[PDB]
Design a protein around this nucleic acid. Structure first.
Lengths: 125, 206, 149, 78, 139, 60, 95
RNA sequence: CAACGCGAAGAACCUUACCAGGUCUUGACAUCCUCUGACAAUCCUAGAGAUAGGACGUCCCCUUCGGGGGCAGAGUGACAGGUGGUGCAUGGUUGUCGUCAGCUCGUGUCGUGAGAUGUUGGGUUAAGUCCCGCAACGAGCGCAACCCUUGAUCUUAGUUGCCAGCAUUCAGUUGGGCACUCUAAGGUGACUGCCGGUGACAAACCGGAGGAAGGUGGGGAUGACGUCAAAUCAUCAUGCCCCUUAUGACCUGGGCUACACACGUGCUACAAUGGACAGAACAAAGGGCAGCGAAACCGCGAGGUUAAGCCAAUCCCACAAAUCUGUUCUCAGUUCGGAUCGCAGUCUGCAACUCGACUGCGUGAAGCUGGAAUCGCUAGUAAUCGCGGAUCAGCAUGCCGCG
């Protein structure tokens, strides 16, 4: 019944979480077929392992935008701010590892005279 | 090459488009219509000096205001020529028009009028030094915060063109908070073409 | 100018054994995520079957056997192009060892990538790899030109 | 290349069918190198403009589906 | 039905007010100016009405005194003053000048002679005070 | 030879293909914009001068 | 009833739309709030020089904003009141 | 460097200027003059222009109806037209050093004068940034800030968006409601602000606490005096030169796409971190009315047919790809690679031959990581993955932008 907001990279996750057993799900569909890789199934359980609220809570998230790590980071930062609004007594401990810092890792604007974002065209005398 | 135009940079953030109306699916012919109507007033009222014109398209009936102070004689006994020019405008635009005239106080520090002036005595063959120097002192006597004037071309020395300027006060083009007003005018003489540019800084915008 | 260094892709902080560290993160210098990690896991497994003991244990033993301590840099002094050896910083050490591991992993040329990296893990745990070979090559050449400093 | 028929310009048609109707013999002039060949102009001769000069060419039986521009090379070489 | 045209005065049933026809966008859809509004109106919704068939903040004085100042400063503001007199429609005006240097006293009178609006400039009469005024009249 | 061809531009040709677009403010045949029927240099001039009621200089 | 208004500058849209809202609320009508619809950009791209250097360019756009207002009850007895008003030519009014 | 996927953000005719041929001369066209006075349109004959004759064929509006105005035709003479050169006559433009921190001036001193001092010295900064000195004292263009966007939050407003607690669906679909997201306005926030330390205490510098953000947060815009006699007479214009029996017009066709070679910039490959086949997903940003065109049906496919909706946060473009899971291929000039060709078609357009793109076929090239060399790139970057837009009948590996 506890709420958080998660934005990572053109991808905003609205997460509401309730006490539970650790059932993890998005858009009433299981993660394991929605994200297949364990390197992003670690994202959900990583903050609730650096703190101790691992098995007492389960999460319900609505998500839009970006690519797979794109909402993976969004999930992460959403459950982060959710646990800050839950028990902010370990706010300091969570801040020490970070994960509340909104990462400025968005795509850069393509600029004229260039290919991509920084690559100059091939140049010779 | 050169700089960007200060007022082109300041369009939409400090400056008005002077074409405030909106068209959609008639944008094109509406737009070229504002060009030829501006051409008509520009080469008709060149005697009494015009700087800028704002066009309104309220209910597609065109609406015009015209600036500057010397058309105080256009406003006066020349209500007849106001009516006649407006009849020619409705002859040109299909749907009719209504015009207004706005007096300008301190017409000395308006860029269009300055540039037209310098082009005029350059056609009248005063020295460019004299022209620029009296005009700049006249503006900063009028109260302008800073004025720089330009001239380029065959400045008497037909065998090699060059450029000349004088400026004092402060002219902060790099600051976008500044109010700048830019003109260019093209003085034609027997030597060919002589270019006039002028811009006026008139304090910042809070 | 100004020396900077930065963390990248480190795993979860607490109870980070190196096996879970490279199970969840780490190394992964093959390209993009996906067809870089799966394959690494398969290589890691095909050596538990080969030697029935700890995969990460033999993996860091292989890394240890790859670890150099001397690396040479060239100099412009003199018209004979002398080269001077320096001590390798540990971050440079691990990234450079892992670099040679991956490059003759893809160079060693077996039928597929997982058995390629698997045989490289075996041939670096034992001292019969091309990377071990070049390790001793730079070691002995640094010992040869060590007189300069 | 479309099944609404091959494309020609009408005026050259009218003269060439009246030509092969009454008297097959002499040559026909054109400036249009664009017309698709029809299989009923076998045996005649056409002076086709190449851009610089009118060139005669003979139409055989197998000359079907082409255009008359295939035979007046506009550009030369060594 | 009626053969409606652009510019026809017309009322819409759904809004009940008088308006003006502009154009026909569809087989039975038109563009209608209703007052300031521009509703796309279907043809069953229209009912026919009729078919197609300054500055004032100023007052201007009748005289001007121009004593003790510059030539090329003044002629900017005597051209302005003549334009103001036309806006108020004065047939006659005067510009009082100085005596000593006298350059502008002879200088202004040549400008009005070639000015596009003034026909003449004349000195005063004995009943007015003589050379205490010099008069100007316009076209 | 510039101005015969713009006369060719307003007066209609014989086929629907031949109506190549032009800008009549300045007669460049290349690089006109359909939204304004206006090409590059004479677009930029009046664009900095103030018209085209909604154009501003981009920065993002 | 619905009304749709759009123009290039939200400094005309703000007080025009607020003036319409306040006129409706002072008149006898039920009217909700103006929802600011998403602005869209038509980016134009144009060369600097006349002849060469296509590696030089400038970017222009056509920022036009749209606000959306509905009247809840139809209120014919005050459509004349919200009809008589006028807005400048800068903004187009749509139902 | 600072020319070379450059003008040209699109050459079948047009564009187009160039060439061959066929044409015309107050003319493609503009202002006037003098008459007919409203006028040309439209279809047949040869016929590319254009001519020849007919058909409504030269027919408007104000007119105290006298005559005027518009709007053409005919004729004429002043004229018109020049992408006909000269960026070394030029205006207006643009690149370049260089986003480098420099560039200068007023007044006063010193020299005689050229000039100097300010602007040097100590310290500091991304910075002529700042501080302290100092015969300089100040000032300006500069730099920074002010603008836009991107990062965190408050209030307002909840529909064409959202679905939280609700009830019901194939789907927020509905019934409901702005909670949340979002939309976009107004705002709040970061300023060495604070602490500790170094530094003369000065300017700063270092580390912390806070903080979404910390030391100009990131990115954009913004280009000083000037240099290259840089380029642009293809927007503009004295100057000479072109003629009206042509360097000016019209028309058709060709050329701008050629080909023994070389250079540049890109694309695609040389493969098993792969290829083929099946399945499962997950974006942003734009466009759409002589337009986008749904679903459905036909066709293997390009596409075709009747066609729903949408002037759009409703509808359409529009099924994103890379990715992941599984099966197979088993290291080869290959189920790699697809070049070039033959055949049959699709779309557009008067027209696809020179000279368009696409589809189904068959054929299948070289090429098994590239010498001397040489380039880009400090993190959402590089590298890869697709997706839009302009230009537009049809045509994009190029450009711009998006994730």
């Amino acid at each position: 019944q506890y709420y958080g907001t998660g934005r990572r990279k053109s991808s905003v996750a609205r997460v509401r979480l309730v006490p539970g057993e650790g059932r993890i799900v998005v858009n009433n569909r299981e993660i394991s077929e929605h994200i297949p890789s364990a390197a992003l199934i670690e994202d959900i359980k990583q903050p609730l392992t650096l703190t101790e609220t691992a098995g007492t809570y389960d999460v319900l998230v609505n998500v839009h935008g970006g690519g797979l790590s794109g909402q993976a980071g969004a999930i992460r930062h959403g459950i982060a701010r959710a646990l800050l609004e839950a028990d902010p007594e370990y706010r300091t401990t969570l801040k020490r590892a970070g994960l509340l810092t909104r990462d400025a890792r968005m795509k850069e604007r393509k600029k004229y005279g260039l290919k991509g974002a920084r690559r100059a065209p091939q140049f010779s005398k | 090459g050169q700089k960007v135009n200060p007022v082109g940079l300041r369009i939409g953030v400090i400056r008005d488009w002077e074409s405030k109306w909106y068209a959609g699916k008639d944008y094109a012919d509406f737009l070229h219509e504002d060009l030829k109507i501006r051409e008509y007033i520009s080469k008709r009222l060149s005697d009494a000096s015009v700087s800028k014109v704002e066009i309104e398209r309220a209910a597609n009936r065109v609406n015009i205001t015209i600036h500057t102070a010397k058309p105080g004689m256009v406003i006066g006994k020349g209500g007849s020529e106001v009516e006649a020019l407006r009849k020619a405008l409705n002859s040109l635009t299909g749907k009719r028009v209504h015009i207004n005239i706005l007096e300008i106080k301190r017409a000395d520090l308006d860029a269009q009028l300055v540039a037209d002036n310098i082009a005029r005595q350059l056609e009248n063959r005063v020295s460019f030094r004299r022209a620029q120097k009296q005009q700049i002192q006249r503006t900063m006597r009028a109260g302008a915060q800073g004025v720089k004037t330009m001239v380029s071309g065959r400045l008497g020395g037909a065998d090699i063109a060059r450029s000349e300027y004088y400026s004092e006060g402060t002219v902060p083009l790099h600051t976008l908070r500044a109010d700048i007003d830019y003109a260019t005018s093209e003085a034609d003489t027997t030597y060919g073409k002589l270019g006039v540019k002028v811009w006026i800084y008139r304090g910042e915008v809070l | 100018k100004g020396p900077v260094a930065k963390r990248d892709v480190l795993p979860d902080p607490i109870y980070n054994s190196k096996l879970v560290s490279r199970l969840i993160n780490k190394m992964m210098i093959d390209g993009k995520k996906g067809k870089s990690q799966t394959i690494l896991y398969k290589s890691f497994d095909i050596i538990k079957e080969r030697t029935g003991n700890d995969a990460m244990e033999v993996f860091e033993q292989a890394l240890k056997n790859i670890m150099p301590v001397l690396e040479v840099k060239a100099r412009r002094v003199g018209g004979a192009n002398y080269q001077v050896p320096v001590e390798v910083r540990p971050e440079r050490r691990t990234t450079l060892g892992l670099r040679w591991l991956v490059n003759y992993a893809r160079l060693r040329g077996e039928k597929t990538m997982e058995e390629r990296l698997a045989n490289e893990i075996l041939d670096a745990a034992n001292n019969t790899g091309a990377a071990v070979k070049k390790r001793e090559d730079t070691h002995k050449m640094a010992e040869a030109n060590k007189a300069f400093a | 290349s479309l099944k609404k028929g091959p494309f020609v310009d009408g005026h050259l048609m009218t003269k060439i069918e009246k030509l092969n109707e009454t008297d097959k013999k002499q040559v026909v002039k054109t400036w249009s190198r664009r017309s698709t060949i029809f299989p009923q102009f076998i045996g005649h001769t056409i002076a086709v403009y190449d851009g610089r000069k009118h060139v005669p060419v003979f139409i055989s039986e197998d000359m079907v589906g082409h255009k008359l521009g295939e035979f007046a090379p506009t550009r030369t070489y060594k | 039905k009626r053969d409606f045209k652009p510019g026809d005065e017309v009322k819409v049933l759904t809004f009940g007010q008088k308006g003006t026809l502009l154009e026909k966008t569809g087989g039975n859809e038109w563009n209608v100016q209703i007052g300031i509004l521009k509703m796309k109106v279907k043809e069953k919704d229209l009912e026919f009405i009729k078919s197609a068939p300054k500055g004032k903040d100023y007052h201007v004085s009748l005289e001007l005194d121009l004593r003790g100042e510059r030539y090329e400063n003044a002629l900017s503001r005597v051209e302005k003053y003549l334009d103001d007199a036309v806006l108020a429609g004065y047939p006659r005006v005067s510009i009082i000048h100085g005596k000593g240097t006298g350059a502008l006293r002879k200088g202004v009178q040549d400008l009005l002679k070639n000015h596009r609006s003034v026909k003449s400039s004349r000195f005063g009469e004995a009943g007015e005070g003589g050379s205490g005024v010099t008069v100007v009249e316009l076209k | 030879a510039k101005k015969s061809m713009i006369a060719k531009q307003q007066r209609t040709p014989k086929f629907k293909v031949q109506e190549y677009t032009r800008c009549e403010r300045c007669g460049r045949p290349h690089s006109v914009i359909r939204k304004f029927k206006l090409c590059r240099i004479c677009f930029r001039e009046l664009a900095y001068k103030g018209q085209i009621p909604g154009v501003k200089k981009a920065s993002w | 009833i619905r009304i749709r208004l759009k123009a290039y500058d939200h400094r005309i849209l703000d007080q025009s739309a607020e003036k319409i809202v306040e006129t409706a609320k002072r008149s006898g009508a039920s009217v909700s709030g103006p929802i600011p619809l998403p602005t869209e950009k038509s980016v134009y791209t144009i060369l600097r020089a006349v002849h060469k250097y296509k590696d030089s360019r400038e970017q222009f756009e056509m920022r036009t904003h749209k606000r959306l207002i509905d009247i809840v009850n139809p209120t014919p007895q005050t459509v004349d009141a919200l009809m008589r008003l006028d807005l400048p030519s800068g903004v187009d009014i749509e139902i």
